[PDB]
Amino acid sequence: GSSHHHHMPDNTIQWDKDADGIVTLTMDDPSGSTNVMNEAYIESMGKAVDRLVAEKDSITGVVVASAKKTFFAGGDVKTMIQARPEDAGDVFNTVETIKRQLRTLETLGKPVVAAINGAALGGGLEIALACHHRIAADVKGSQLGLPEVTLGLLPGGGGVTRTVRMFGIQNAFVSVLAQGTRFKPAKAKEIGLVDELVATVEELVPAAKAWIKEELKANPDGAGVQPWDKKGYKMPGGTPSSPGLAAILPSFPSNLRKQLKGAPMPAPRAILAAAVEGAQVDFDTASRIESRYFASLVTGQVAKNMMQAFFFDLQAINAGGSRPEGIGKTPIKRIGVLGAGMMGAGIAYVSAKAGYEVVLKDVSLEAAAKGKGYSEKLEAKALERGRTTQERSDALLARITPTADAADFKGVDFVIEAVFENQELKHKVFGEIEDIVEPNAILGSNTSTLPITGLATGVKRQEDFIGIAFFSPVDKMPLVEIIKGEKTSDEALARVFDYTLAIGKTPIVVNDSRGFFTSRVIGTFVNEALAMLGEGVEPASIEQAGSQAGYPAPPLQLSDELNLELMHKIAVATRKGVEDAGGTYQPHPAEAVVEKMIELGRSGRLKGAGFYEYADGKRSGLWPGLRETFKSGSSQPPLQDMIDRMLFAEALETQKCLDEGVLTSTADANIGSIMGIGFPPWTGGSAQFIVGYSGPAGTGKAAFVARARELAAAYGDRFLPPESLLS
Amino acid sequence: SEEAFIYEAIRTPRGKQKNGSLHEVKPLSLVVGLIDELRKRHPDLDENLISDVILGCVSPVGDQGGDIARAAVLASGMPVTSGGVQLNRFCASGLEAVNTAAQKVRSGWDDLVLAGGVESMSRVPMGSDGGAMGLDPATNYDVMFVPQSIGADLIATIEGFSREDVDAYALRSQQKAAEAWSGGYFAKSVVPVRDQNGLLILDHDEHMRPDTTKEGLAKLKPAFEGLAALGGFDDVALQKYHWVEKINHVHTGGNSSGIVDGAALVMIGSAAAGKLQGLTPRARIVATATSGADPVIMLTGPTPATRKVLDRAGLTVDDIDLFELNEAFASVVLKFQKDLNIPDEKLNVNGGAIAMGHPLGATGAMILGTMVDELERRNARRALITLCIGGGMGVATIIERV
Amino acid sequence: SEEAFIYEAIRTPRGKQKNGSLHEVKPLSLVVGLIDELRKRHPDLDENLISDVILGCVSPVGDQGGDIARAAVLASGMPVTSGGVQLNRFCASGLEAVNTAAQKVRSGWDDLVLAGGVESMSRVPMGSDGGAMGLDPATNYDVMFVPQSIGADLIATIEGFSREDVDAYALRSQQKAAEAWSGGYFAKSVVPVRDQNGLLILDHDEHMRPDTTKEGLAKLKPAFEGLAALGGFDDVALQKYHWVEKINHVHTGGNSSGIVDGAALVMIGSAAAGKLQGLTPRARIVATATSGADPVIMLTGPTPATRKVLDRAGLTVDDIDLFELNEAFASVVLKFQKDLNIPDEKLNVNGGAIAMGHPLGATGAMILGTMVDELERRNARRALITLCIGGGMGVATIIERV
Numbered sequence A: 001g002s003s004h005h006h007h008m009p010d011n012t013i014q015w016d017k018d019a020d021g022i023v024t025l026t027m028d029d030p031s032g033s034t035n036v037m038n039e040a041y042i043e044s045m046g047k048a049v050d051r052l053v054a055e056k057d058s059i060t061g062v063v064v065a066s067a068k069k070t071f072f073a074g075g076d077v078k079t080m081i082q083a084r085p086e087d088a089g090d091v092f093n094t095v096e097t098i099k100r101q102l103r104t105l106e107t108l109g110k111p112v113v114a115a116i117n118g119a120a121l122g123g124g125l126e127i128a129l130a131c132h133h134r135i136a137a138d139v140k141g142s143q144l145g146l147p148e149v150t151l152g153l154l155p156g157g158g159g160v161t162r163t164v165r166m167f168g169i170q171n172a173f174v175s176v177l178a179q180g181t182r183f184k185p186a187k188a189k190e191i192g193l194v195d196e197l198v199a200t201v202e203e204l205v206p207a208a209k210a211w212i213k214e215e216l217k218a219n220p221d222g223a224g225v226q227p228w229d230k231k232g233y234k235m236p237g238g239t240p241s242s243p244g245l246a247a248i249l250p251s252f253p254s255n256l257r258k259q260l261k262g263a264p265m266p267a268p269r270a271i272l273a274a275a276v277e278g279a280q281v282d283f284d285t286a287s288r289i290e291s292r293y294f295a296s297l298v299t300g301q302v303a304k305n306m307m308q309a310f311f312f313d314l315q316a317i318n319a320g321g322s323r324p325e326g327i328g329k330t331p332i333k334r335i336g337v338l339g340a341g342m343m344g345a346g347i348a349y350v351s352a353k354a355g356y357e358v359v360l361k362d363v364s365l366e367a368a369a370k371g372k373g374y375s376e377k378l379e380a381k382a383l384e385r386g387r388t389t390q391e392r393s394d395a396l397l398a399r400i401t402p403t404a405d406a407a408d409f410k411g412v413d414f415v416i417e418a419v420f421e422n423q424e425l426k427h428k429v430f431g432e433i434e435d436i437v438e439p440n441a442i443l444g445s446n447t448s449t450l451p452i453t454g455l456a457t458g459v460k461r462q463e464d465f466i467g468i469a470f471f472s473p474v475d476k477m478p479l480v481e482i483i484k485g486e487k488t489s490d491e492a493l494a495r496v497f498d499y500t501l502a503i504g505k506t507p508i509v510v511n512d513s514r515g516f517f518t519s520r521v522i523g524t525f526v527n528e529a530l531a532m533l534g535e536g537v538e539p540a541s542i543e544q545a546g547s548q549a550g551y552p553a554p555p556l557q558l559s560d561e562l563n564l565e566l567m568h569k570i571a572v573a574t575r576k577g578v579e580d581a582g583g584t585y586q587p588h589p590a591e592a593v594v595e596k597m598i599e600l601g602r603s604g605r606l607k608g609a610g611f612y613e614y615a616d617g618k619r620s621g622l623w624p625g626l627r628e629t630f631k632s633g634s635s636q637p638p639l640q641d642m643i644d645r646m647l648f649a650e651a652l653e654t655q656k657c658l659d660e661g662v663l664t665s666t667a668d669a670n671i672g673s674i675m676g677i678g679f680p681p682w683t684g685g686s687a688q689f690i691v692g693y694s695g696p697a698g699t700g701k702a703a704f705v706a707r708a709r710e711l712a713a714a715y716g717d718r719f720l721p722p723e724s725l726l727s
Numbered sequence B, C: 001s002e003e004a005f006i007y008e009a010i011r012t013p014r015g016k017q018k019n020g021s022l023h024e025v026k027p028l029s030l031v032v033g034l035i036d037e038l039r040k041r042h043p044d045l046d047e048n049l050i051s052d053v054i055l056g057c058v059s060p061v062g063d064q065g066g067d068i069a070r071a072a073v074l075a076s077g078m079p080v081t082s083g084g085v086q087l088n089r090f091c092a093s094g095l096e097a098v099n100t101a102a103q104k105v106r107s108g109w110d111d112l113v114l115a116g117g118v119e120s121m122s123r124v125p126m127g128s129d130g131g132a133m134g135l136d137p138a139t140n141y142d143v144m145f146v147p148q149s150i151g152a153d154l155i156a157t158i159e160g161f162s163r164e165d166v167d168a169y170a171l172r173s174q175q176k177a178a179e180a181w182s183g184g185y186f187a188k189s190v191v192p193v194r195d196q197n198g199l200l201i202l203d204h205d206e207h208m209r210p211d212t213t214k215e216g217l218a219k220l221k222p223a224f225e226g227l228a229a230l231g232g233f234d235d236v237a238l239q240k241y242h243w244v245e246k247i248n249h250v251h252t253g254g255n256s257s258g259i260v261d262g263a264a265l266v267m268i269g270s271a272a273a274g275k276l277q278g279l280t281p282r283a284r285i286v287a288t289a290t291s292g293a294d295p296v297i298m299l300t301g302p303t304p305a306t307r308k309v310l311d312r313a314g315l316t317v318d319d320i321d322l323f324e325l326n327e328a329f330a331s332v333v334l335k336f337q338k339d340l341n342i343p344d345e346k347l348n349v350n351g352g353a354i355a356m357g358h359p360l361g362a363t364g365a366m367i368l369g370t371m372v373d374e375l376e377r378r379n380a381r382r383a384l385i386t387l388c389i390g391g392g393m394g395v396a397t398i399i400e401r402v
């Protein structure tokens, strides 16, 4: 009814008591290489906590260590994703039991030291936060934080309640909880997550026992007592009833709604609510409030979407799901880059930053120096003044050898072209070193719209030609869209798949088709907004609908960076592509809006005038002439219809890519839309959106096709669901 | 059934927030001072007939906590059977106390009731009582809390009221309030505050700046620019009002209501209680109404509340001689005027809170008695009093001169 | 004119102060939980007809500040035209909200009004709002402030109620409350409090001690002996009551009301609004009255307030079937019974605050709905509800079953 056990699993904790009376709980989950907060942990920790209370007369200190390479990494994702609202009681009881074990360990009357050897993430850090002293090994790769918000969850194992007690409402929320930021051992010591650092892992447990022997002699009265358990505790920054905090407290939910732009992501709201409500009551009552908010997220649909995408889908991508099965790992010596643009020169950055000895060449040495100049004044001018290992930029800069046409790319096993999107130019560019590089070399292409099959005809070894599409900026964008040509071998796809992982990026495999996946799907999002402007919808509403939907940038603003003249070139090329195939072309209503804007000379940010005004490299407000040009205000649909029209357009089109064979898995559709198209993370991807849709029609796939037919009956037959959805 | 009449309506002068004359006077004394004045006007008044004392107060904490209405009954030596109750409907608390008192009389279960308000903002600052709509993140996030000043700038942004438009009304309020004091319009209803020795503390509305010029108002800075930027409340308001691109911040310290101290008191009773106490009725409460509108802009409550009380009384906008809307912000009055198409000559004819200040809990009762005097001074019949309320509420009252 | 009828009357269970189940629930949630329950009973109810939400609250500060009634309207998704106002007449705030709502209906200017109260004493302790009657020395010295507990012992001293006499009533309250729960008297009106996930938080009045014995009550210590000695409040009370030699301190934790959390809500409207919304009237508000008595003993207000509402309705003590006086202290009920000579069988028939607790702002509305159920359960007609108030006030209400 009220214990350390949840109502026959394997034991995951090893007991060890020395002659001094110090107990060392070594966490070592046998089924797995990492300690996970699963059912085996709950029963094992329950037994160990019961034993700490039973032997409390012969125990003087506790040391919580780990036997894995890391410390402890979160909870069992496969169980939490199955939690339905009917299981709210079981979820509540489980996290109550976990916290009750930590609370007993915390109020044991004895100092408990956490020996953090590796990464302590999620529930792992919560276990260390229940201790009284935390020692971390200062080694790179040991992250510390509470990343539950990234999965649509909250730190429901005391993470919210304890960090707020340690740092206050504002500091714990902004720096730790709201974003789930991860810290290095030296950085966590700076803020105060861990208390002291050791050089090596071998000196961790002996230092933990040394601190207990010193804490018992120096501070015997306050031994094993947390600050919030002592009489006279004052929360940093005050309580909600303090006049200083209560003056700025009304701005906390408004600034959160400002950062989220009104997107329907419930986790940060629940974190802030639980943190402030917990700050008004005692610790145990605060812990219980945290449990009810946690149960509210896990049983919700948004947390299921993000766990599906940011855990299961992303793990399947890195597991080689789309990698050709049974292909060996071929080596890689030198890399040849042909591009000095914002995206071309950035490709040479991520490759040289991993040790590859790349050779950049872009026409004469003037553009090549400008291409190499993109890494210059940025490889260390805005990077050396950073965190750690700024004196190792030599191996990351001496590798890249920028030259011009004088160099013939001698002994290069990988070519990544990144010039202007021109067919005839791309043919002869690769033909300059077709027989000069290594006999077995990849011929990549960073194309966005041109079919990769036709580009392969410009080289003899077409089996090694393949599309390798990056995203600007290459140093900050993690998605790489690999486009498979008609004659692209699986060995080439495997070599490019392994390259993207060594870079640190996330690959997706795409078959050669019109617009591929990212460009084709993002076009329907932009086209839907332009169509609404032509219908008479206020431009301010269209931008707000895009922001509140979850997109990182509103669509009309995005239509200025993606130049309207470049959008018109895609429209005329798709027309000539389907008419020369025999069929008839049906223009999208967004085309007439584009043709009007280019007629007024407002082509976008490049010229300095588009849907917004621009002056001195800064974006101003919307152009006042839009309201009279497109009769803004004559059409006032519901804001949720504007949001759904933009979300369903990308949802129906990503389904067609799966039907047409452009994508081979919904994991590519979900991760590809999140990391390349800017699809809202709370949806879990453009494919997860159809199975996790929720609205006035209901929830699931049946409610999606019902809402789709409702949008189709009011905004055009393009919103009719495909036959693959079985309507 | 039984009609409700106003027999007396008095108030104190309004002392300003910074270096104010009333800062040394505790809020209870302001109410007791008005009770003593009501005793001077009717010494033969049998105070045992008074069954209730209803005071509105927006920050009922500290000096204003613990049911200050009951504290005023006991401190003033009123009979122990005179009740005493504090209420809070934000900025309309003063008028809500009047309406409740009139409705208690109209039910026949109460004969003679004292109603009013009190607010010492220099001693008990606004927001001292807390609240969930602002301090509780779950409800703040759900209701989309936006301060009243941000909603006032959004009203000017939506309706197209420029900085010069709101500063123009602000100048007019200073002028009409200055002409009202010079003409002796307020000599009979403003009761000078005195100390326990009888020495004068304050006898005039010291927040007024009678020498205000249109050029001097244009030199003032928008007092709510940093509130909207650092608080992100502009982004919140524009998520609800998505068709508005940017909020034009036009309200400053010269076109917004003043933060002042003050109290007001009205005496309401049935016709039977008036003749039994020898009291002559000054005006009759025609009808009261409570409505509301969107809480994000918060300040558009008076419009549906005014229409409802007009329908209850079976009247139109043309049937009312004087309109009195509290001048919380300039754009609120300009928007209320545009909503119902009211001539500028019959709207806040003696100036309002922009010049004389806005003592939250007392303002509703102050402007009510202000209209009682103007109906008798002009020999007009009907007047409508309404105020904008936090959370998007609205309260309106129609009175008829007797 | 228009009669006022009670259509619904619900309340939450009362959670105790120490290790209470409702300590984790903010006061706003208790009111929203009752609003949601009223929605379940009438899904076709047009909430736009609701013109007011009147909640009594004695400590309107922190979680209960900023007009919590309006916060409940917005947080529960009620229409923005539904008003929202907080009032404070101390311990009678819950019943005063009901009376005001009934009087608003009886004036014809309001059709359907929601009335109730809310008090989370475990989160917002009594006296957190301050007040002049206690914290201002001039008025404390003049009014001769004496805490309510000292006045309760003085009532037992004057009337000769012994320690065994008050402990006898305390035992009876535990018994009648235990029999009321076991008999299912409260199953239809006590709405269990649940969290946002639907999990149960509290479904019963956890302050009750059903296994109370007369021997166990005699073992308790007078909880107000140190208050009277260190505070000198006994000397103050005996200066006003000079013929009393010494105050007999008889009230302890077993014969005084409990400090608990809770909320209550009642729906009042005219007969026209009931037929228009398909609502069946449960009882009719016959008459309301507000009186008072000496504020030093403070707790003798119910007697003149009860006589006044009996004269207003033209009735006698014999015309009422059920008397419900809040059990603030045992001697208050014994004194009220001796004043009007009421049989013990018809006085607080289902137990009271001594067993189930006394949530200040909500108690008046809780015991009102308690009497609505007993009138329909017993098929009786009339019931009288009254409470003792701080400052010596008194409020009484008579209801008739329909």
Ligand SMILES: CC(C)(COP(=O)(O)OP(=O)(O)OC[C@H]1O[C@@H](n2cnc3c(N)ncnc32)[C@H](O)[C@@H]1OP(=O)(O)O)[C@@H](O)C(=O)NCCC(=O)NCCS
Binding pocket: B018, B091, B126, B148, B149, B209, B212, B213, B216, B217, B220, B223, B252, B253, B254, B255, B256, B257, B258, B259, B328, B358, B360, B390
């Ligand atoms: C608008 C507000 C912030 C101004 O506060 P403030 O800065 O203390 O106001 P002050 O008038 O004392 O100062 C403002 C400046 O404008 C000037 N000013 C104000 N009115 C002026 C006038 N008519 N002519 C010339 N100057 C004027 C002042 O002299 C001052 O300039 P200074 O500082 O150089 O002397 C404040 O009055 C307010 O918030 N209003 C209340 C509105 C409200 O929220 N009420 C309802 C609460 S529920």
Ligand SMILES: CC(C)(COP(=O)(O)OP(=O)(O)OC[C@H]1O[C@@H](n2cnc3c(N)ncnc32)[C@H](O)[C@@H]1OP(=O)(O)O)[C@@H](O)C(=O)NCCC(=O)NCCS
Binding pocket: C018, C091, C126, C148, C149, C209, C212, C213, C216, C217, C220, C223, C252, C253, C254, C255, C256, C257, C258, C259, C328, C358, C360, C390
């Ligand atoms: C009287 C009062 C001071 C008691 O507070 P308290 O000491 O916290 O009350 P508790 O009942 O928790 O504790 C009192 C003791 O009596 C015991 N007790 C109470 N009722 C009992 C019963 N029926 N049978 C047996 N023991 C009982 C308790 O168990 C406790 O003994 P313990 O401490 O050994 O456990 C408090 O209830 C009070 O002030 N009442 C409110 C009255 C009031 O002022 N209200 C209006 C405000 S405007």
